[PDB]
Every structure is written in C-alpha cells, then in structure tokens.
Design a protein around this ligand. Structure first.
Ligand SMILES: [Mg+2]
Ligand SMILES: [Mg+2]
Ligand SMILES: [Mg+2]
Ligand SMILES: [Mg+2]
Ligand SMILES: [Mg+2]
Ligand SMILES: [Mg+2]
Ligand SMILES: [Mg+2]
Ligand SMILES: [Mg+2]
Ligand SMILES: [Mg+2]
Ligand SMILES: [Mg+2]
Ligand SMILES: [Mg+2]
Ligand SMILES: [Mg+2]
Ligand SMILES: [Mg+2]
Ligand SMILES: [Mg+2]
Ligand SMILES: [Mg+2]
Ligand SMILES: [Mg+2]
Ligand SMILES: [Mg+2]
Ligand SMILES: [Mg+2]
Ligand SMILES: [Mg+2]
Ligand SMILES: [Mg+2]
Ligand SMILES: [Mg+2]
Ligand SMILES: [Mg+2]
Ligand SMILES: [Mg+2]
Ligand SMILES: [Mg+2]
Ligand SMILES: [Mg+2]
Ligand SMILES: [Mg+2]
Ligand SMILES: [Mg+2]
Ligand SMILES: [Mg+2]
Ligand SMILES: [Mg+2]
Ligand SMILES: [Mg+2]
Ligand SMILES: [Mg+2]
Ligand SMILES: [Mg+2]
Ligand SMILES: [Mg+2]
Ligand SMILES: [Mg+2]
Ligand SMILES: [Mg+2]
Ligand SMILES: [Mg+2]
Ligand SMILES: [Mg+2]
Ligand SMILES: [Mg+2]
Ligand SMILES: [Mg+2]
Ligand SMILES: [Mg+2]
Ligand SMILES: [Mg+2]
Lengths: 124, 208, 71, 83, 99, 138
RNA sequence: AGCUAGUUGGUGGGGUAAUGGCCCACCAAGGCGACGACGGGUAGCCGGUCUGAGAGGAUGGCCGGCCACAGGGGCACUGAGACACGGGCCCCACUCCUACGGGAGGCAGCAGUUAGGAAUCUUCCGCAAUGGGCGCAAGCCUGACGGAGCGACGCCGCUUGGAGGAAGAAGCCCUUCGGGGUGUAAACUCCUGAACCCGGGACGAAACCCCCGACGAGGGGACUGACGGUACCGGGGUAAUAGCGCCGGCCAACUCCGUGCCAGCAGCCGCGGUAAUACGGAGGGCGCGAGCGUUACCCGGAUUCACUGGGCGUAAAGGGCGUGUAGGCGGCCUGGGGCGUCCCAUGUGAAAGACCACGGCUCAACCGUGGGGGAGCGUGGGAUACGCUCAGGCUAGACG
C-alpha cells in the first residue's frame, strides 16, 4: 500500500503460533499415563504404532509417541515428554524420551544409542 | 584436542599429498605415492559427482588437517581474520601460520607438524627467553624463538636441525643452525607459501 | 531382534468399515478393528462380511489386528 | 559524603583498581562521578599506576575525601605534593 | 531553555485558562513520512486577553494545576478562525464516531 | 492531478527512452530546469530548451542514446537504463553528508536538493552538505 | 467507543523542603477522546544482549543505571533522607508456643531444608585486598566483597603421543575368488615425558600505626594472606580416558546380512507389502570431538507483514457505487519568515560491552590502558534549493 496507510494502521505482526502446548515452552514435561495403546497411521502408511495417552503436570490430556522396538510402559508409569510432531499420527505432537523414568533403554541397540537412551556395552 | 590416530588416511581421502608424516610422507609410503585412492572399501569405486558444497567442505578439511587443529579454534581464527581489514583469505592463512607449532615446523625444529606440537607441549621451545607450552601461540613478526637450554642436548632435534642444514628456510623466517635458534621475521603471504589450498572455497563454505 | 509375540488367530468377518478395516469376530473372543495387510492391498483381494480370515493380533492392547490370509 | 576511591574491575587473583571520585552510599562498582586514575596491584607493567593530577587536585579542592589506599596512591604519584 | 512552543487558542471556557493546540510536525521513526501531530495544552493567562482563535507563544512553566504547565509569552497572529474550526469539527465528529 | 511535477517529468523521460523519440515535451518549472541542467552536465541528455505549446511554457528534452546495437533486439543502446523518484510526495526522505547513497558504486547518480542550490553527489560530498533525495538515475 | 464528577478550571485555606486537585470549603461546567481515551490482556524499564548485510526483530540472564516490593493490604512516626527489606502499629492469610486470657514470627540477604518442577550450587574459609560504617585512634563489625566447593552450564586452552614401521600379519568384512578394504593403523624399534612424587615458593601489601618533621609536605620503621603450600619455577618421572551423530535428496558420507507396509525411521518429501545406498545389525566412511546429538525458544533463511522490499484482471486479495468529514496529498512565478530539512560549532550521549590499537595472565578466553565512533536530543550561528507558512500575481488544473 501507501506509507500513509501504514502510518495510520501499522503492519499486523506475525503472532508466532505455538506448535507445542507442552506449556510455558517447557523443553520437556513429565507426566503420568491414562492408557498404553496402539494406533493405525493414515492413507499413506500402515503400521501398528505404539502410543500412550498422557496426562501432564501442566494439566492437558495429550497423546504421545513411544520410541525404539520393545517398550516397558504400563499405565501409572511416570513418563517424560520430548515434544516434536510425528507426521503420521493425528492429534499426536509429543514424543517420550526413552532412557529416564518409566521408559528405559531399548535393549539390543548398539548403533543409534543416545536418541533411545541405552547404556554402552563394555567391550572385550 | 588432537585428531590423533590414523593420518595418511586423511591424505588419501583428499587425493592430494599432505607430507603430514614428514619423512615417510616423503619416502615412497604416504600411501599417496604407492596407493592413491579414497580409504575404506569403496576406495576403488567410480567417483561420485561432488556436490558444490562438498568440494568446498573437502577443501576446508584439507586445510584444517594440514596444520593439525581443532575445528572450533579454526572457526575462531577465521572469525578474527574476517574482523581484520584486508584480504581475509590471505590474512587468515598468515594468522594460521603464525601459530607456534606451525612456526616450529616451518623453521624445521621438528620434521612434522604433530611432532612440532608435541615438542611445544613438553617444555622444549623458548619464546624470547621463556618457555611456552601452547600450540595456539600467536607469534607476532620480528620474534625470536629458541630451543631450551637444558633441552638443548637431545638427539632428535639435532638430527632435525642437520636435515635443515643446507636447504632453504621459508622467506618470512630465518634460522641459526648452531645456537639452536630462529627468527620469525615477516607475517607470511599467499604467494609466499606452496600449499595445496584454494582458500576462497573455504571462505565461501564458512559464510553459511 | 524383531520381538515376536504375535498371536496368529482366525476369525469370521463382522463389520465392513472404511479403509478396509474389518471388525473380525475372532476364534479368541472379542472383535476389534483389525485392518487389511499390505500384501492383500497389492494383490487386489476383496473381503466381504462372510469369510473366516486370519488376524495377526498384538498382546499390548487387543483392539487392533491384521487380516493376513485371503479368506 | 563525596569519596575518592579505588574500584575493583578486572578478574579473580588478577585485580585492577580505578582511582575514582564517587559518593559514599555507592556500590564499589557503581556509577561514579569521575574516573581520575588507574592502578594495578600486580606491578605487572612499567606504567602500572597513573593518576591525572589536575582533576584530582580539583576534586580535593571541592572537598572530596580519600580513603586510605587511594590517599597513599595519590601521595605516591604526587598530588598532595606542594611547591 | 524554558521550551518554546507555537500553537493556537482553541478554547476559552474558563477563568484565566487558555486551551492551546500545538501541531508539532515530526518524522516517523520508520516510514520516513512526516506527520502533523497535535497535542493539547492548557496555559495560565492572568488577563483573559487572549481570545478564541489566536496563535500564541507557549512557554515551559512551573505548574499551576493538574495538567496546566505553561504561561503564554505573547501573541503571534490574531484571529485565524480556520484552524480553530477544523479542530471543532473533529471534536463534533468524535461524538458521531461512537456507536 | 499532475501531482508531483518532478516525478512526472522523470516518467516522461523514461517513456521517451523506452520508445525512442529524440525529443519530449513537459510542463515548466525552475526545479525541473535545474534538474535538467544537472542531467546535461552529467551527460544523460544531449540538451534541452524551453518553448511554447498553447500559451503555456514547456521544456523540450534533447535526449541521448548510445550507438545503434548489433544482433537480435536492435533497440538503440539505452543511457538512462532506469529512473526512479525516491522522495515520493508524502514519503519525503532526507539525507546528510554521511548518508548520500553511493549509487551504482559510481556509474549512475543520485540527485540531491540542498541548501546550496540543486546539485549532485560528488558535489555534495565536496561541499560536505546534505539534502533531499529527489531522484536516482542509472 | 465514548470515558470522567475531585472529574477539569477557579478563589481561599490546609498539607508539603517545594509546585500542584495532594486534599478540603465554595463557585464555574468543563476536560480528554478514532492524531486511540477508558477497558481488557500482556509487561519492569534501560545501557544492553543475540541475531541480522543492514533496516529491523526478538530479548532484557549476569554486569551497571533507575523504578517497584519486601506474607497480602493500609498508615504514619523518627530523622538530612523512608512511608522504611533483617524499625512500629492495625486488619486479613498462614506456621509457632498457650496455665485458651494472648503473643511470636517473615530467608524476594548468604547457605540450605522443603514444594513445585525437565532443571539450578557448598547449612564453605576469610577480614588479607577493596568498599561500607562507627570511632581521635587502636580497633570492632561486614554471607558487600574476596575466594575456594559442586556442575563439560557456557566460552577458551591443553592432554589422550610423536619419529620410524609390510607393495600390506592377525582380527573382522566383503568378493567378479584373483583380490580389495580396514591401514602405517597395529605390533615392534627409538624418543618425549601429561599424570605423579620430591625441592623450593610467591606477586597480590603498603598503607592506616609509630618516631624525626608543627599532628602539613616529606623521611625512616614495624605489623599484616582466606586464596594456599595454590600458581609457578628446579629435579626426577609413566605411553598414559574416546565418544557421539549421521550416512536416499537437502547434506559431508555405501556396501552386505537380518527383516518383509511387519518390526520400525522420520525434519520434510517420504522410506518399508522379499536384492530396502532411507528400517535392525556389521564393517567402511563422513561430521565434529572431551563432546556430539535430541528437545524447547528466538532471530535468520521468509523481500512469508515487504520502510529499504511484495501484491491485489485469472492465484489470497478493489469495498457495490455515490456524495462527503476528519486526515493525507498538491500547478506556475516573485518575495519574505526559516517551523521541517541541511550544515558548522559545541553540551550531552556515564562506566561495562560492541570497534581499532597496544599491554598484562606462558597463548587464548578473561582482563587492563588509550583512542575512535555513536543514532538521537539541547543550545548558539548560518543556508534557502525543497516541503510548510504569510503576501502578491498567473492561466496550463478545476468550476462557471
Ligand atoms: Mg575444547
Ligand atoms: Mg512381529
Ligand atoms: Mg469538593
Ligand atoms: Mg495554593
Ligand atoms: Mg485527582
Ligand atoms: Mg494481569
Ligand atoms: Mg520490551
Ligand atoms: Mg541489574
Ligand atoms: Mg519503598
Ligand atoms: Mg508485614
Ligand atoms: Mg506491605
Ligand atoms: Mg540522623
Ligand atoms: Mg521529620
Ligand atoms: Mg514495613
Ligand atoms: Mg537463598
Ligand atoms: Mg529437594
Ligand atoms: Mg519434584
Ligand atoms: Mg556459586
Ligand atoms: Mg569468620
Ligand atoms: Mg576497609
Ligand atoms: Mg573498644
Ligand atoms: Mg562470590
Ligand atoms: Mg571445566
Ligand atoms: Mg604412529
Ligand atoms: Mg609441592
Ligand atoms: Mg594406544
Ligand atoms: Mg535413525
Ligand atoms: Mg535419513
Ligand atoms: Mg541401514
Ligand atoms: Mg549442545
Ligand atoms: Mg513495498
Ligand atoms: Mg506476494
Ligand atoms: Mg481471487
Ligand atoms: Mg468510492
Ligand atoms: Mg480536506
Ligand atoms: Mg496541505
Ligand atoms: Mg561507553
Ligand atoms: Mg574500554
Ligand atoms: Mg598478550
Ligand atoms: Mg496564493
Ligand atoms: Mg464548462
């Protein structure tokens, strides 16, 4: 437009939408689990994905993805949220970190380790 | 700190000679001389087209490995160079050279850069009358550097000196071959050095 | 690893849902939204409510299976 | 009260003091009126201490008061010197 | 300097008090464009001499009231009812703007 | 409204350059005349004069071009590649001695109305004065 | 979208160090507002910080300024100064004692407990330095401060060896069975000598005091150490922690086996339903490296809120048009004013940083010294082309 218009009104600033209500911009959040269940992905992909319905110390009821290949998660398991969309699962926004709390290191991982929070094999 | 471990492998990866063993990298043995190909399995695989980032990256790696440095340090040096007035590529190079280990190497107090660094570390080199033990020492021009007095007596250094007896010492430096001494005179230039570098590429890589 | 605890149980097809997600009244007991295998999708194999299909069921939560065998 | 005092800047073990003119009720690091000189305890430099004399004299005249160390420093660098 | 300001008498509806309109022109901090920016002021005048429509010199002063911090130095131009009227019309419109 | 005059003049010039008629007609101002003079000095136009169209004073513009060009797109080589009025009326910009913008690194020019008449970039620098950034030419 | 009744202005008084609707008595009936009032939400604010080519944008941790609040609220007193952080009173909320009548409290001081929470530190030594405050002084106080403790929390520095050493051991992996890879890597030779132990050992600290000099200037003397037997130097002296990410494209780096749209990976495209350079493993490689990756959050890339620097026939997007208010914007000539605007001088722009130079801690980070710049704002002077303004005219706009 014309600078006069700008002067009159101003530019409507990019109010940055939050991708994550982990509240506060809380870089993690620990919480307890409603139900450990399993979900169908979408139109492109098909695989029984291991999810957890999670209640948080923020106060929200959000679903969360569990990593690895063999989990050890119950229900009143104390869990730690990572945050970060998986693409496939809808309504799903937060990962869980395996390695601390009631999510321990996935055994039989020796390559991709830290991301899954599993300790080192003492080499011979 | 150090890279440490397998060296001539880096040279192989680069494809242009390093002289990073010194001798050995001088004898028919750097693997560059006898073996001239990428390391690991696909060492003999028909060359992938290097993406334009990749070439730059490779060049940077070459350069960084040449003087034997941590990458953070290198980055800092680059930043400093950029901050300074002049030709960044040339000035940066000069500054890099102006590190103590490099100086030691180029004056031939040790025959390899790693070796030079080691020597610097243990309490061997003496800056204007006092020992310094840090590879990242920035030696400003017109500066006098010696071998230590009670460390004056070691055989290796003598041998190295002898090797540097007869042949030329880089234009910006000069050495005393008897009193175990050496001057760093001028802050080295682009044309003053025969490096395998193309510093422009490195600079470009850094920009991002 | 590939942790195999998968229960290979048969069942009569109950309710035809979208996406080829067939409620299958199993020989085990309760019906779940068990969907169709990728193999079946590839070969173009139509299931109707009236077949005894094999559903490969998970022990974590018996709510979702997988129709593997053609009828 | 208006005080002429050293202020610590610098580092741990490696101290550095500014001969400064400031207020009584101020932070030892605080917004002083006027930087008048400098002194390093470590004697590390040949030009370790230096004051500007004229300004110091002026401050004294108004009625600024030196604390002890500051006073000593002034004496050393010649301000209380009379001729 | 006891700050010196140019502006017009928009209102006398008061004992001794004059209302002044300083149209200070300023640049915008961003878009370059210069804006006629108006601020109202209230000046003490110990005479009632200054009438509805006069441009006057307003001086930074010690306060006499809850926002009334200027004496009138002097008259500049008497009787420019144009700039008066604009303001009045704007004020009138303000009543029309609501609801 | 023929609203800004200078801008209008510039536009006319640009149009002329685009469609290659060695002369154009624009209404008459002192400001305009001064600008034209500056342009002439610099070399962007062969000259000008001021004649009459309908009992109204008018400034003719004797344009300039570079040599008739080779190959495809014959179009005589253009000397005024581009023109732009920066201090657009209402959006009025003001620059100082440390704010004269080095236009094309030196191969076009800016035009700066100053206290010291109507004048150019180098001149401004010499005289150490600032003013209004009416226009940019390259 | 209207708000306002001590609310706006007045006279007097009171109160105050001092103006004042701060408050009161009485009179007037205004005032502000779409140039964004009141209301809501949000929020300490800045020097700054990070980013960014810059303009900007976001941020305001520490460090310095200034405000504000010391359970919540409200108020005074005293004093030069508070409406008073470790001073008072009173109500409410809470924890402590109670012989039930009543009091005690306030760590948002250091240290820690407790809670929340992903997450944050030693119930540390010292008055030695500097500052504080009292005191003639000695001195006394000081969780200001100085330091140590813990944490790869961030940045920087250094170690985890180097010189040899096969046209190439084993180990392990592919194979087109020749061979290649790992890899000069190893082993082994030589040397060095971080760690480590012994020998010393600070600089930081010379004053305040004392005497000669008048209790001045000046001169001599003494005492003074938490850090810390630390740093550092002298001698010896051991080859002495490597990890994590990724490896389809972006994007640096590929093969084999396992697995079969399953298990899984994912930042996006998307990979996987039997030869997966995308999944699990194994080598190889690549990236950095005592760290690297994940997550949060900000800027960048987004010239994707566009002032620099975007658009609106069909992509999001011209309102249905008219009249018209504020507003914005404006023809040609001549003169004045000089508000904008420019210029020159200065005053300011505290320090720290950011920038240059130099110096110091064995380099660097860190830190010092000196300079320079600095948007903006104030004052003095000028300039008048350009906007503005006032005056006069002009007919090309407009109207008749
Ligand atoms: Mg490091
Ligand atoms: Mg299975
Ligand atoms: Mg009343
Ligand atoms: Mg009064
Ligand atoms: Mg009031
Ligand atoms: Mg609120
Ligand atoms: Mg802010
Ligand atoms: Mg602060
Ligand atoms: Mg207070
Ligand atoms: Mg209280
Ligand atoms: Mg209170
Ligand atoms: Mg008192
Ligand atoms: Mg009092
Ligand atoms: Mg109180
Ligand atoms: Mg505390
Ligand atoms: Mg606790
Ligand atoms: Mg907790
Ligand atoms: Mg601490
Ligand atoms: Mg004590
Ligand atoms: Mg003291
Ligand atoms: Mg006593
Ligand atoms: Mg401390
Ligand atoms: Mg550390
Ligand atoms: Mg070796
Ligand atoms: Mg000892
Ligand atoms: Mg080893
Ligand atoms: Mg992975
Ligand atoms: Mg990938
Ligand atoms: Mg793989
Ligand atoms: Mg990190
Ligand atoms: Mg634009
Ligand atoms: Mg667009
Ligand atoms: Mg459309
Ligand atoms: Mg319309
Ligand atoms: Mg109008
Ligand atoms: Mg106008
Ligand atoms: Mg400063
Ligand atoms: Mg400085
Ligand atoms: Mg130095
Ligand atoms: Mg007129
Ligand atoms: Mg007509």
């Amino acid at each position: 437009p014309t600078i006069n218009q700008l002067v009159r009104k101003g530019r409507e600033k990019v109010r940055k939408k939050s991708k994550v209500p982990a509240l506060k911009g809380a870089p993690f959040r620990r919480g307890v689990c409603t139900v450990v269940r399993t979900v169908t992905p979408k139109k492109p992909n098909s695989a029984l994905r291991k999810v957890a319905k999670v209640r948080l110390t923020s106060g929200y009821e959000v679903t969360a993805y569990i990593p690895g290949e063999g989990h050890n998660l119950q229900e009143h398991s104390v869990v730690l949220i990572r945050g970060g969309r998986v693409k496939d699962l809808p309504g799903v926004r937060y990962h869980i970190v395996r390695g601390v709390y009631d999510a321990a290191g996935v055994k039989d991982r020796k390559k991709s380790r830290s991301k899954y929070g599993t300790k080192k094999p003492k080499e011979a | 700190g150090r890279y440490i471990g397998p060296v001539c492998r880096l040279c192989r990866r680069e494809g242009v000679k390093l002289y990073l063993k010194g001798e050995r990298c001088y004898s028919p043995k750097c693997a560059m001389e006898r073996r001239p190909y990428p390391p690991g399995q696909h060492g003999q695989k028909r060359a992938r087209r290097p993406s334009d980032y990749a070439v730059r990256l490779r060049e940077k790696q070459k350069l960084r490995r040449i003087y034997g440095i941590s990458e953070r340090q290198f980055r800092n040096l680059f930043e400093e160079a950029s901050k300074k007035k002049g030709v960044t590529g040339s000035v940066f190079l000069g500054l890099l050279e102006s590190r103590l280990d490099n100086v030691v190497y180029r004056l031939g107090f040790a025959v390899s850069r790693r070796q030079a660094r080691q020597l610097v570390r243990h309490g061997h080199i003496t800056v204007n009358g006092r020992r310094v033990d840090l590879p990242s020492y920035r030696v400003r021009p017109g500066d006098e550097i010696a071998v230590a007095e009670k460390s004056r007596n070691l055989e290796l250094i003598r041998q190295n000196l002898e090797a540097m007896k007869g042949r030329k010492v880089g234009p910006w430096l000069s050495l005393d071959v008897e009193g175990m001494k050496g001057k760093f005179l001028r802050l080295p230039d682009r044309e003053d050095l025969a490096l395998p570098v193309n510093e422009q590429l490195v600079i470009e890589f850094y920009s991002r | 690893a590939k942790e195999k605890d998968t229960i290979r149980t048969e069942g009569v097809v109950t309710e035809a849902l979208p996406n080829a997600t067939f409620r299958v009244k199993l020989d085990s007991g309760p019906e779940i939204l068990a969907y169709i295998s990728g193999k079946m999708r590839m070969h173009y194999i139509r299931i109707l409510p009236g077949d005894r299909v094999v559903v490969e069921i998970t022990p974590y939560d018996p709510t979702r299976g997988r129709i593997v065998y053609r009828k | 009260m208006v005080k002429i005092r050293l202020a610590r800047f610098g580092s741990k073990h490696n101290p550095h003091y500014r001969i400064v003119v400031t207020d009584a009720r101020r932070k030892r690091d605080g917004k002083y009126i006027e930087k008048i000189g400098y002194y390093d305890p470590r004697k590390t430099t040949p030009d370790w201490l230096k004051v500007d004399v004229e300004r110091a004299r002026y401050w004294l005249s108004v009625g600024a008061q030196p604390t002890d160390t500051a006073r000593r420093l002034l004496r050393q660098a010649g301000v209380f010197r009379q001729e | 300097p006891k700050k010196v300001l140019t502006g017009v008498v928009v209102s006398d509806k008061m004992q001794k008090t004059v209302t002044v309109l300083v149209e200070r022109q300023f640049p915008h901090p961003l878009y370059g464009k210069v804006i006629k920016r108006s601020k109202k002021y209230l000046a003490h005048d110990p005479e009632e001499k200054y009438k509805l429509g006069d441009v006057v010199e307003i001086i930074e002063s010690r306060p006499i009231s809850k926002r009334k911090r200027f004496r009138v130095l002097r008259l500049v131009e008497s009787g420019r009812m144009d700039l008066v009227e604009k303001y009045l019309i704007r004020r009138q419109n303000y009543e029309s703007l609501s609801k | 409204m023929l609203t800004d005059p200078i801008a209008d003049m510039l536009t006319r010039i640009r149009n002329a350059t685009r469609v290659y008629k060695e002369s154009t007609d624009v209404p008459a101002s002192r400001f305009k005349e001064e600008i034209l003079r500056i342009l002439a000095r610099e070399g962007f136009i062969k000259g000008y004069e001021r004649v009459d169209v309908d009992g109204k004073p008018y400034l003719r513009v004797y344009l300039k071009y570079g040599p008739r060009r080779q190959g495809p797109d014959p179009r005589p080589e253009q000397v005024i590649h581009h023109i732009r009025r920066i201090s657009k009326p209402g959006r009025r910009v003001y620059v100082g001695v440390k704010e004269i913008p080095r236009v094309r690194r030196g191969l076009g020019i800016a035009i700066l109305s100053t206290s010291k008449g109507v004048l150019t970039d180098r001149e401004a620098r010499k005289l150490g004065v600032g003013g209004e950034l009416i226009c940019e030419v390259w």
